[PDB]
Amino acid sequence: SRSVLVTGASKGIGRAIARQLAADGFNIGVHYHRDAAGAQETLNAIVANGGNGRLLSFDVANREQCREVLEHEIAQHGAWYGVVSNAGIARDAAFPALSNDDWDAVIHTNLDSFYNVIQPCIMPMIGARQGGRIITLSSVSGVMGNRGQVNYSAAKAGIIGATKALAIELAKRKITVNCIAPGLIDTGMMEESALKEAMSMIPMKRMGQAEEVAGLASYLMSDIAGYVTRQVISINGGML
Amino acid sequence: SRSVLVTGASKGIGRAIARQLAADGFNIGVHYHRDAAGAQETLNAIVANGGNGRLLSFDVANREQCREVLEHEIAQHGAWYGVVSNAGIARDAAFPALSNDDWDAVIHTNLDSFYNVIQPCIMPMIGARQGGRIITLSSVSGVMGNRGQVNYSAAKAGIIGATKALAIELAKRKITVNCIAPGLIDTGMIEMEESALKEAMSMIPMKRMGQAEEVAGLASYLMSDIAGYVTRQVISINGGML
Amino acid sequence: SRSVLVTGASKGIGRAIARQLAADGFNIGVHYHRDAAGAQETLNAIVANGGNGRLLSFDVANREQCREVLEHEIAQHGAWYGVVSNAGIARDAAFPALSNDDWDAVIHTNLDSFYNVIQPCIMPMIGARQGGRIITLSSVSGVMGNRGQVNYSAAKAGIIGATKALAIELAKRKITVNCIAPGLIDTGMIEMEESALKEAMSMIPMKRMGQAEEVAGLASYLMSDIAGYVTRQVISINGGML
Amino acid sequence: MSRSVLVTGASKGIGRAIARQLAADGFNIGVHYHRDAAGAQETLNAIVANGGNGRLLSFDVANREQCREVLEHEIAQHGAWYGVVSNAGIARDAAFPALSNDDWDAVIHTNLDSFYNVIQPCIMPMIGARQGGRIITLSSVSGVMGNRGQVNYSAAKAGIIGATKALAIELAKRKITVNCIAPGLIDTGMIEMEESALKEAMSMIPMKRMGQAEEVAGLASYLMSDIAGYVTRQVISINGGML
Numbered sequence: 031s032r033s034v035l036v037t038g039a040s041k042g043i044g045r046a047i048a049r050q051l052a053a054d055g056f057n058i059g060v061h062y063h064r065d066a067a068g069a070q071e072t073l074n075a076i077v078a079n080g081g082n083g084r085l086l087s088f089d090v091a092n093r094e095q096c097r098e099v100l101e102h103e104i105a106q107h108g109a110w111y112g113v114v115s116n117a118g119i120a121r122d123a124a125f126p127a128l129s130n131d132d133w134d135a136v137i138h139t140n141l142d143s144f145y146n147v148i149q150p151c152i153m154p155m156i157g158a159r160q161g162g163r164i165i166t167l168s169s170v171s172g173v174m175g176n177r178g179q180v181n182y183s184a185a186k187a188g189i190i191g192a193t194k195a196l197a198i199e200l201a202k203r204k205i206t207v208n209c210i211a212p213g214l215i216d217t218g219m220m221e222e223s224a225l226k227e228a229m230s231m232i233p234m235k236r237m238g239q240a241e242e243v244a245g246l247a248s249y250l251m252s253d254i255a256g257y258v259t260r261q262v263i264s265i266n267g268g269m270l
Numbered sequence: 271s272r273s274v275l276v277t278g279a280s281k282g283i284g285r286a287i288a289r290q291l292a293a294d295g296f297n298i299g300v301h302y303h304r305d306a307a308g309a310q311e312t313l314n315a316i317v318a319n320g321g322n323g324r325l326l327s328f329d330v331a332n333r334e335q336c337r338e339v340l341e342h343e344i345a346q347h348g349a350w351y352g353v354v355s356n357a358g359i360a361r362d363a364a365f366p367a368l369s370n371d372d373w374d375a376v377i378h379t380n381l382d383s384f385y386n387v388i389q390p391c392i393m394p395m396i397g398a399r400q401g402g403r404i405i406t407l408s409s410v411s412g413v414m415g416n417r418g419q420v421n422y423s424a425a426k427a428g429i430i431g432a433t434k435a436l437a438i439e440l441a442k443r444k445i446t447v448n449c450i451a452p453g454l455i456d457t458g459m460i461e462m463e464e465s466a467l468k469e470a471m472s473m474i475p476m477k478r479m480g481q482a483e484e485v486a487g488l489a490s491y492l493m494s495d496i497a498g499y500v501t502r503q504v505i506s507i508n509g510g511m512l
Numbered sequence: 513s514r515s516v517l518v519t520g521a522s523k524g525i526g527r528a529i530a531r532q533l534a535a536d537g538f539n540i541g542v543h544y545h546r547d548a549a550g551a552q553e554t555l556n557a558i559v560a561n562g563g564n565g566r567l568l569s570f571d572v573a574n575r576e577q578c579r580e581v582l583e584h585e586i587a588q589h590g591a592w593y594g595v596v597s598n599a600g601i602a603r604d605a606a607f608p609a610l611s612n613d614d615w616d617a618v619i620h621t622n623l624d625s626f627y628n629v630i631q632p633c634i635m636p637m638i639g640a641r642q643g644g645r646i647i648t649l650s651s652v653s654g655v656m657g658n659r660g661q662v663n664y665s666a667a668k669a670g671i672i673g674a675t676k677a678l679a680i681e682l683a684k685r686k687i688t689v690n691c692i693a694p695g696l697i698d699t700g701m702i703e704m705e706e707s708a709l710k711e712a713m714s715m716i717p718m719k720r721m722g723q724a725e726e727v728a729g730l731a732s733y734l735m736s737d738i739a740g741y742v743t744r745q746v747i748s749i750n751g752g753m754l
Numbered sequence: 755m756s757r758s759v760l761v762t763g764a765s766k767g768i769g770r771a772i773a774r775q776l777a778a779d780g781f782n783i784g785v786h787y788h789r790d791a792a793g794a795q796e797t798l799n800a801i802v803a804n805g806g807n808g809r810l811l812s813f814d815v816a817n818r819e820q821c822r823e824v825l826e827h828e829i830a831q832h833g834a835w836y837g838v839v840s841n842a843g844i845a846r847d848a849a850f851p852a853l854s855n856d857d858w859d860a861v862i863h864t865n866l867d868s869f870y871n872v873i874q875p876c877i878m879p880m881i882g883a884r885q886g887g888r889i890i891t892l893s894s895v896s897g898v899m900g901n902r903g904q905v906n907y908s909a910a911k912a913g914i915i916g917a918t919k920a921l922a923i924e925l926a927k928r929k930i931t932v933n934c935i936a937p938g939l940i941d942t943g944m945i946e947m948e949e950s951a952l953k954e955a956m957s958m959i960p961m962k963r964m965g966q967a968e969e970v971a972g973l974a975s976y977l978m979s980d981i982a983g984y985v986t987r988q989v990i991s992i993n994g995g996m997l
């Protein structure tokens with residue numbers, strides 16, 4: 031039984047990833063920040079479909095809380111086989127109007143979470159000797175940049191760099207490290223004007239669904255994907 | 271029943287792709303150039319595992335033959351749902367030593383095959399209105415270049431450009447078009463001394479070659495219904511080379 | 513002192529590159545295919561500004577003619593220090609409507625020219641021991657793909673792959689090999705209706721076409737002595753398109 | 755119009771070389787330093803001795819308030835910068851599981867937060883001056899491809915690339931270009947390697963040598979020039995063919 035931590039599994043892409051990986055047979059750490067009810071709904075659906083998992087909670091910007099909860103989880107249940115670092119936020123504004131909090135909240139939550147969430151999981155993953163899987167969530171904005179989102183583009187591009195560097199370090203230990211960069215996905219995470227501009231750049235002329243992102247995570251998590259590492263794979267309807 | 275043409279299915283990556291997609295439930299056009307016995311072995315294994323397929327043959331450098339065989343196949347059996355353009359060759363030498371035939375054979379076979387194989391399949395795929403899948407095989411040398419292979423790097427990079435452009439054209443028709451760029455994969459194509467193999471391994475963080483089956487797993491994902499929003503991509507399966 | 517061959521120097525980007533590099537002090541091989549008058553105009557402007565150069569001609573799709581002319585030029589004048597492989601064409605159509613000639617003319621002219629033009633220049637460039645510069649012209653379509661241009665995207669992406677591979681081979685010999693990928697540049701190559709131009713502009717953050725002279729400024733940088741550590745790169749000059 | 759260019763980390767290495775080259779090109783240089791005042795003065799002395807102009811200034815790029823205060827004062831006193839070269843950076847290497855809190859935070863705060871801290875105060879004035887402008891950031895090959903033992907540095911430097919691209923799109927209509935230079939291995943004080951480690955690094959560089967600071971400065975000079983007005987949103991790598 032291999033366990034997979036999915037951050038932000040209370041809704042959207044994280045929920046869809048949690049459901050799919052549970053169906054694949056992984057035991058899921060259904061993580062949430064504040065939306066306990068949403069996480070329980072995710073878990074209920076996992077269980078009702080014959081899968082297994084459990085709830086856990088932490089703020090990915092809170093380093094100490096991440097370390098404490100994760101060390102406790104690992105002591106009680108053993109090392110994670112997989113870690114899907116999905117939780118993220120956006121705080122959009124034109125660059126010259128971006129507040130201190132807009133910048134810091136996005137960098138601290140989206141980028142520092144790489145260190146806060148993943149670092150406590152690594153030595154135990156290595157210690158278990160089953161190999162492993164690390165999957166991060168970036169964004170097309172991290173690959174190409176996006177107007178009104180200098181902070182988000184920075185954080186999400188930073189995730190890509192972290193992911194690539196860690197891939198090289200862990201390659202000999204049979205742990206793959208990859209990044210999924212979704213384009214525009216239909217979730218709770220913008221104006222009609224902005225949506226139109228986004229659509230015009232999407233050859234498929236539609237948003238992706240959370241379940242489609244989950245299908246890619248399912249592939250990367252599978253045993254047959256063991257030679258895929260250090261990659262950013264974009265699921266974006268042909269945007270780039 | 272959706273059919274998938276797999277070029278170069280008589281050995282190596284093409285064989286592995288053929289087997290995997292057959293197991294996924296696709297009816298396979300098991301293509302070969304000259305290795306009929308190899309293609310039959312691929313098909314026998316497909317059938318023995320409860321799948322379906324048929325043999326067909328053409329030179330991917332021979333435009334007229336490709337059109338003739340493919341039009342006949344489509345008239346007799348209906349449009350392909352998927353096309354995996356896998357057939358390829360290498361003719362390595364230092365750039366100043368590369369012969370006319372070294373350059374032309376690699377460009378004509380690897381790059382012109384995009385047009386020769388894929389063009390006859392497109393209007394029928396559109397006409398069938400089931401959407402579709404096009405998967406091309408490039409290489410890490412097409413992404414980053416490789417010494418002693420200016421011809422192969424050129425052809426393989428050209429496949430990437432063709433793939434991306436066609437992706438944009440076919441997006442509204444629910445046909446995805448993607449490229450797989452393997453790194454070093456353990457097949458009959460690769461013939462290296464121990465010294466050369468060590469040099470190659472030093473650039474691969476995983477310190478091993480890929481297996482044909484691993485490349486087939488990625489083709490299987492791209493072929494699946496859940497991958498309908500993935501298009502215009504080059505996905506590299508290379509043990510972390512880049 | 514140091515000579516630079518600029519293919520397609522009779523108009524557009526090649527002319528602008530020829531003029532700029534001549535102003536930088538390079539002796540220019542002002543190449544043309546059929547537009548002798550245009551090449552002479554380029555040369556007259558070079559000379560009038562205190563620079564030097566000479567006319568030469570060949571079809572970059574004609575391998576034998578390229579070798580013959582270039583071997584003669586090199587025997588008579590010595591090795592080129594730089595080669596700017598700029599000549600190119602487009603033959604646009606939707607992929608299923610692309611004729612045999614549309615595909616072949618674009619691949620043969622744009623991609624085979626890498627081999628036909630550059631190969632005869634390499635051993636002499638090495639033999640001269642002055643180091644060197646090779647600059648190819650690709651396109652944003654070669655980086656990202658472009659609808660209605662599967663052939664051009666393929667050829668231009670192939671140029672990138674060739675360029676990267678040759679860069680690795682020549683690095684120890686102090687010859688840099690790089691690719692310039694312009695976006696939309698205001699030359700005779702571009703023929704768009706007002707409607708099509710607006711669609712193109714909407715994807716360009718700078719909301720204007722580039723000028724040939726801007727592309728020439730980048731070539732001037734890559735040709736300069738201070739750029740000796742830049743190799744294996746595709747540099748895009750495209751107003752922020754990507 | 756004498757055009758001024760701020761060069762962070764101009765007291766040594768790449769920043770010094772950029773400062774010298776852009777001064778020779780005719781730009782008035784803000785020769786920035788953090789703690790190495792003597793080094794910055796030597797950069798400025800060489801600028802002046804060669805017939806150029808510039809002035810010293812100082813701030814910690816991790817200190818947001820100090821950056822805003824100094825830069826607003828500089829802009830009030832001398833007018834808007836035409837160019838900003840965000841060059842200052844550090845490395846704090848260790849294997850990912852051994853990386854300390856300070857190793858991670860110092861690299862992210864200094865290398866990535868500096869984009870916001872240094873560049874934001876310069877933008878509205880640059881726009882207000884109506885001369886267009888140039889923003890050049892310094893990333894690294896490790897930001898493009900990742901590098902073992904540097905998950906923090908790779909993250910920060912890749913983050914700079916993303917910030918650079920996004921800002922390029924915002925400022926394109928205002929004739930301010932925004933680009934990133936990603937050097938490979940450059941011979942400065944930042945690099946401290948044993949002979950063994952140097953050999954391993956060289957094996958990945960087709961040119962089999964380190965770059966020189968002056969070479970990086972040549973690329974900055976091109977991007978700063980008027981003829982480079984259509985080049986924006988790019989990461990240009992100067993790395994001897996590494997990638």
Ligand SMILES: NC(=O)c1ccc[n+]([C@@H]2O[C@H](COP(=O)([O-])OP(=O)(O)OC[C@H]3O[C@@H](n4cnc5c(N)ncnc54)[C@H](OP(=O)(O)O)[C@@H]3O)[C@@H](O)[C@H]2O)c1
Binds near residue numbers: 044063090119168214
């Ligand atoms: N949607 C898109 O179009 C899109 C595009 C590109 C990339 N992405 C990336 O994909 C990931 C998920 O996106 P999504 O649209 O599914 O997000 P979403 O629906 O907005 O959900 C965000 C999730 O992250 C959690 N979260 C937010 N702040 C947190 C914090 N400080 N600590 C811990 N968890 C926190 C939330 O938990 P609670 O509800 O419990 O607070 C929630 O489950 C993000 O990294 C995002 O940047 C999304």
Ligand SMILES: NC(=O)c1ccc[n+]([C@@H]2O[C@H](COP(=O)([O-])OP(=O)(O)OC[C@H]3O[C@@H](n4cnc5c(N)ncnc54)[C@H](OP(=O)(O)O)[C@@H]3O)[C@@H](O)[C@H]2O)c1
Binds near residue numbers: 357409
């Ligand atoms: N192996 C690697 O390391 C590697 C790495 C990156 C990319 N690739 C690419 O992956 C693809 C498959 O490679 P592989 O190693 O599986 O090759 P392989 O084992 O050598 O198989 C080559 C296949 O291509 C077919 N073929 C060759 N010339 C042909 C022609 N003119 N017309 C039609 N078919 C032709 C062959 O048919 P017959 O045997 O019937 O003659 C054979 O089935 C190629 O495109 C290759 O460039 C391979």
Ligand SMILES: NC(=O)c1ccc[n+]([C@@H]2O[C@H](COP(=O)([O-])OP(=O)(O)OC[C@H]3O[C@@H](n4cnc5c(N)ncnc54)[C@H](OP(=O)(O)O)[C@@H]3O)[C@@H](O)[C@H]2O)c1
Binds near residue numbers: 573601697698
């Ligand atoms: N304009 C753009 O927006 C744009 C964008 C991206 C890339 N590019 C690339 O930039 C390069 C130059 O483009 P341009 O816009 O300056 O084109 P142009 O104005 O159409 O000039 C084309 C040049 O190519 C030469 N040429 C054409 N066919 C040839 C052949 N078979 N053999 C030898 N020479 C041949 C022509 O010679 P004659 O005049 O003697 O016939 C001419 O000098 C091309 O490689 C093109 O693909 C252009």
Ligand SMILES: NC(=O)c1ccc[n+]([C@@H]2O[C@H](COP(=O)([O-])OP(=O)(O)OC[C@H]3O[C@@H](n4cnc5c(N)ncnc54)[C@H](OP(=O)(O)O)[C@@H]3O)[C@@H](O)[C@H]2O)c1
Binds near residue numbers: 791815842844864892
């Ligand atoms: N050298 C390489 O191989 C290489 C490769 C890729 C990228 N880079 C990048 O190139 C840039 C310059 O590198 P370099 O090798 O020239 O570095 P260097 O010789 O270490 O010089 C570093 C400069 O950064 C300044 N600095 C450091 N921390 C600072 C802070 N908190 N606030 C303000 N300024 C600070 C220093 O100021 P004081 O001296 O006054 O303290 C110094 O002038 C960096 O961003 C680096 O990451 C270097």
